[PDB]
Symmetry: C4
């Protein structure tokens, strides 16, 4: 009926309250559950959903064998209610996709699903499930996108795509989409920067995206922009380094930190003035553990000092991708934009002795009331019957 | 649209008509059914639902192994339609929780889910699925709540939480909640009393809660209160003792009956003037059997005499927790508050030779027409394939 | 919103067009499907549903073992959409019941579920899922009802219950129900008659019920009545005998035909003037085959001549119970009452080498356009894995 | 509420964007998924659905054995949401059918399901699930229909049925249906032509159907007609031959091309002026591969030259039936009729070493933006556990 306004500011928060846990892998030991990756949450004005990519194989079946291309023609974007195990019996089909994003403008769902060959992949955009536009690769080298929700403000939704090497300079574009039609795009002028798998959120009528530098940055890049795609770029300055892998905390940089800068993990962070909430793994080397850190000057200053840490997953347990999501005033009844996040808990290959790899999910919302750290890990006992 | 009024009196009844039976365990021998505990029913102005806690494991799977903490990070509050087996394919996610309560104010669902560590657990309150408040532990010793429905009157919902020892004096609070926000709380001044797992129901614009004394009472404690949290406390006086374990019926007390007073089972009872409907197990020592007893003076007098008994489950079959639920006039069309109850039929450990423990459920509503006693037990044949 | 009027006459028809087939047993060889009996169809002003009784066990599981009481505390009335396999994942819970009826008045569903002991069983009546009344046994000898839909006319719904011997004279009552409350009942004065498992349908503001004589009739008894429960009784006169078992067709009677009169099968027939559509098995001795016969004088004349036969199930395949259902003008848009019927295809014990017994279903609607006979049998290949 | 107008022209397009992929077979290796054929898509003004025929057997079960009649009494038309694996837990029942069509007029669904014996089969027509008419065989030799969607224009829906030999001259009729009632039919005068399994679509208030000649044509026949059933017939003229099997491309004919003309595969094509979009297999001999070809003069000229080819499935992978579907302006918001297509990917017998045969599906919509060819095959690894 009416577009989400997108004009409120992020809510003042003090900590993170647990929102969901699906136990998808534990349930999938016996039930009929998809093998999934990137279980990103996104919400409308009425409800929240978990989106995910599947190869159309179930846990404990031979088709879950992971020695197959990530970018396969079987890969599909699907969604199910938040907190449920992702099954063929409760999941909706969204798009054929090996890279994706989705977001709700207040009226209907936009989904973006990229499929096709590496040298010519096409993003199919859908609005309320009907194809409304396509974007084809402009460098012929793996067109790819956020793997989390796009950001909507007053009926325009915004996303970021990358095309080019994942181990060197690439090309980055921002897209403005209305009723699933591309109305504007801009190519970033970002020499020496690298953007992948952006987590973008609206805040006071502009978008902020925090991304992954897979080339040569162990801190995270960011790009922010207004409704006309006039943008700014930088890297998060804090010495509390956000990517995985990374060095031990040390002197930061408002450009890419080259030490342990290659590879990465999808991640997010929330800017509050000169301060920043960072979610990151607990290990510097593997996707293990998860913590939220408040660094009151960490957006702009390069020291390694921070003031608050909240435990989310212990370093003895596997974590994985994570991303932002918001809950607008039209859903919550609040006067401010609520920040939330999800974490993927990756099980299986390469770290564990299975034929498959899947994630389960947890999610949290920021609140200004009492909270507590704990560890909420995946909890499945591997290997499974199919691995014997 | 409009809040439940909560101002009517309990319906005059003569007996208990059977309302539901889910056969969850029998079905879960082959189907994909959660291992559950505390299958409490609660209703809105339109429908009733069964809420429950799961560890996110299914029957007949290795993850159902019960030599694990009750208070785990895997534990979740879920709900499904009354009378259906609780499966990942028909259950909705509500909250991450190892102790919970839920209730509908006429407008939306309030859910309360407690997770986190023993020394600092946090109740996450949700209204229509959106986080609206948190309550953190105030004694740092296992914040916990009803495991049945909270009580709503004219848009305010009420619950009771405990924090402190389960084998000695603890601390008890009543909470008043509006649109999922705590608007008032009071700490009971109840020396020598013990409250756990309260069953609370509205009756004539006030709430009555009947609970479990785990310290030193084989009769049940109660607390009643008005909308401003001005309260009264006591224990049910009847010599028809309500808890399990308990002594043989004898002289009662309007304080805790110390004989066989340690441990307990979640239970309920309904006050009608000086009279009381008690639901209890049939065994004095184990959670076996279930019966409803009408004691016309049993709220206030300490004799062991009663006038009506209705069989629910035979003493040769396992029972478990039980709790109250009501059905308001906005749902039923009646001019009075309808009392109902559920019973959990616990199967597996510690009494039986399985690796797991789960409950199925039955429920009954009070009526003023003809009724009959019978035994409606769980009916599964144990052990299961996973226990071999 | 508005009650079904129930004042139209049965549609003129010439034959029977196939309406549904669920293939429940074939699907249940692998899927998670209830063991069921009496899959009766009933419709509202918007949709049709299949109701059924289950013991809360699934096909191919140990709990499906049939050497158990029919009248057990596990037995439940459930419903699912017409034409779907009856699973815990698509079925709704209605009532705890070992004998049942249901019907929709235009506004909400009435369900009637009988449970409890043989010497004191209680029918629980629900309207829109809320308990609205109870009827207790009046002879203390197996209170039981239709196992098919009740009949509704202008907001009053009507049913027939029996209490007493199934091998001798019993007691028969008609009940008039409004918003799930009994407003009137009458006991039939029917010496030497026997009524069980009535199929009742509305026609021109009155109800006609065709039933099973289990005592001493191989033709079917009937009772018809107006809104004030003023009734008439008889037996279908045709020599085309309707029950199973029965003798070969011969001279009929407008009283019970004693030859092969003991035992029976639930069945139906539709009166059109002095003429009758009879559905019956093809075998005189076992529940095998199914056919529809039009006998233009068969309501009132005792000859064995008929004019039309339409094959439904071949005599080489198992049939079972069958019952009427109607589709009112408020659902169909027609100016007349549409007659339909379902058939249960019974598989397993006692005729086949399994531990279990279940039915699948087929259904047909009367039409005045071209039709064709065929055989639409169950089609499962027995025995199943659990029987090995 | 309001009928689809059906008066717009096909959208100008340049290529085909991927719309769905269900991975039904891969998922059905472990989950509970029907064995299916003819997964045709059809849409309303609100949503799209996949319709299909099942024998009521699941993958990996003994009942999936394919040495059984295609025209069995077990065969049923069912439907599920586009892009989901077709399971008993997410599929709706539509009709008992071994040949079918369905379409939505803007108000409700029409379904047409043919069952019964070869010498007298009856199409049961339903509108909003209620039987509204029947059509019986007029040649007593396998009455059969489209196996894809019928075409609706301003409240009248249109379909084509065949009756007679599949290896010689037969009889062909067009039917006009309103609210599920046949209002008009015409028999084609088409000597030497053969029509089976028509794909029909509306375009500018008329219908075009492209079909399969099973007798003696390796090009496809067509019939077009207006709302009064005044018709024209021919064969697609292009030397880019459309059927399977077929000869190598060569000189075409605006009559049947006899070389490799016997047998066939259900297919479609879209007429744009004198030009045509043809979907066909890549192999000339087996149902392998799939491609879309634009031949700018191919409706009317017989040369073998074409200008655009888009890969859909590689020749090393199995394809199967394919059919048209449209998306009207009332669904899309466009000013033109959107052309789409589905393809069935047939796995199992006769080409592969299994006891069963099933299809999965992919679908595509025409767009005027950038697109790309690829191969999106079924992807299951055969044989399955049941075949061992
Ligand atoms: C933030 O925006 C709200 C909502 O703006 C309206 O809805 C949007 C989707 C878009 O359509 C806008 O153009 C609409 O005005 C603002 O609230 C509105 O303010 C206007 C101007 O005073 C007023 O007339 C409306 O009644 C308001 N609507 C509501 C529902 O309150 C709000 O002022 C903006 N806040 C800030 C801080 O920018
Ligand atoms: C019990 O309360 C009912 C309902 O009260 C209304 O709805 C509540 C949720 C709340 O909003 C109240 O403040 C509302 O009045 C009472 O019925 C109402 O009585 C008032 C006063 O006479 C009258 O104006 C309304 O029409 C009534 N509403 C309805 C639907 O009947 C009722 O009187 C109370 N009964 C008792 C015994 O206290
Ligand atoms: C059969 O009954 C219809 C409907 O009657 C109405 O709806 C019923 C549920 C009940 O509420 C009745 O008391 C209602 O009248 C009759 O149609 C109605 O006829 C009346 C009297 O002429 C007229 O005023 C209404 O408009 C009619 N309603 C509709 C929807 O047509 C109809 O006459 C009856 N037919 C026969 C043969 O008895
Ligand atoms: C195509 O048809 C549209 C819609 O026609 C209406 O809806 C149909 C289902 C049917 O009921 C028609 O008889 C209706 O007119 C035409 O648009 C309508 O045009 C009329 C005539 O000018 C106008 O009064 C209406 O407002 C229009 N309705 C809408 C929703 O725009 C349209 O003109 C037709 N287009 C062509 C090219 O034939
Ligand atoms: C897992 O898959 C591996 C290779 O698959 C091989 O590759 C796939 C893509 C197909 O081509 C398959 O037919 C090939 O054999 C195997 O090496 C491995 O054995 C597979 N199975 C396992 C690990 O159990
Ligand atoms: C059931 O679980 C028991 C112990 O689990 C042990 O504890 C759990 C929490 C994990 O740490 C597990 O890896 C440990 O082995 C076992 O003792 C027992 O064998 C388990 N399996 C059974 C009973 O089959
Ligand atoms: C099927 O059930 C039969 C008897 O059950 C016996 O009766 C039931 C009600 C229970 O009391 C059960 O524990 C008893 O053993 C058995 O005789 C029979 O073996 C059962 N199993 C089969 C046929 O596989
Ligand atoms: C598959 O089915 C084949 C024949 O079925 C035979 O035909 C069916 C219709 C039934 O009559 C069945 O009872 C008959 O045996 C068998 O030849 C074949 O063995 C079946 N099983 C397989 C291939 O595993
Ligand atoms: C929001 O978008 C609407 C519709 O395009 C436009 O009229 C309006 O001015 C926008 N509001 C703001 C505050 O930008
Ligand atoms: C019920 O709550 C409303 C809204 O807060 C208040 O105005 C009203 O007086 C309350 N009614 C009663 C009887 O307490
Ligand atoms: C139908 O029932 C209504 C409401 O009780 C009554 O007023 C009306 O007269 C009835 N109509 C007929 C035709 O009996
Ligand atoms: C569409 O059908 C309606 C209702 O039958 C008729 O009045 C109208 O003229 C039709 N419109 C056109 C353009 O044919
Ligand atoms: Ca990096
Ligand atoms: Ca700092
Ligand atoms: Ca105690
Ligand atoms: Ca007493
Ligand atoms: Ca008999
Ligand atoms: Ca006769
Ligand atoms: Ca051909
Ligand atoms: Ca050409």
């Amino acid at each position: 009926s009416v577009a989400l306004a997108g004009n409120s500011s992020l809510c003042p928060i003090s900590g993170w309250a647990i929102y969901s846990k699906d136990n998808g892998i534990r349930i999938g030991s016996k039930g009929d559950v998809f093998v999934i990756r990137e279980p990103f949450i996104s919400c409308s004005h009425l409800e929240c959903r978990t989106f995910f990519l599947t190869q159309g194989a179930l846990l404990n079946d031979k088709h879950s064998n992971g020695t197959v291309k990530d970018r396969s023609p079987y890969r599909t974007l699907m969604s199910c209610p938040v907190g449920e195990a992702p099954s063929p019996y409760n999941s909706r089909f969204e798009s054929v996709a090996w890279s994706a994003s989705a977001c709700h403008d207040g009226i209907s769902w936009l989904t973006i699903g990229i499929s096709g060959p590496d040298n010519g992949a096409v993003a199919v955009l859908k609005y309320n499930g009907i194809i409304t536009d396509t974007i084809k690769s402009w460098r012929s080298n793996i067109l790819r996108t956020q793997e989390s929700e796009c950001a909507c403000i007053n009926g325009s939704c915004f996303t970021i795509m990358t095309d080019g090497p994942s181990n060197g300079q690439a090309s980055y574009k921002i897209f403005k989409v209305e009723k699933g039609k591309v109305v504007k795009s801009v190519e970033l002028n970002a020499p020496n920067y690298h953007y992948e798998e952006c987590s973008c959120y609206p805040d006071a009528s502009e978008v902020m995206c925090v991304c992954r530098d897979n080339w040569h940055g162990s801190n995270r890049p960011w790009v922010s922009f207004n409704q006309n795609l006039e943008y700014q770029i930088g890297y998060i300055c804090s010495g509390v380094f956000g990517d995985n892998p990374r060095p031990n905390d040390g002197t930061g940089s408002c450009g890419p930190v080259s030490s342990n800068g290659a590879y990465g993990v999808k991640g997010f962070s929330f800017k509050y003035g000169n301060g920043v909430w960072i979610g990151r793994t607990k290990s510097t080397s593997s996707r293990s553990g998860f913590e939220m850190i408040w660094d009151p000057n960490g957006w702009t200053e390069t020291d390694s000092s921070f003031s608050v840490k909240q435990e989310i997953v212990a370093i003895t347990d596997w974590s994985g991708y994570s991303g932002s999501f918001v809950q607008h005033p039209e859903l919550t009844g609040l006067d401010c934009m609520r920040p939330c996040f999800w974490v993927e808990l990756i099980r299986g290959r390469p770290k564990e002795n299975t034929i498959w790899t899947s994630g389960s999910s947890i999610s949290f919302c920021g609140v200004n009331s009492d909270t507590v750290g704990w560890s909420w890990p995946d909890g499945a006992e591997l290997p499974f019957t199919i691995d014997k």
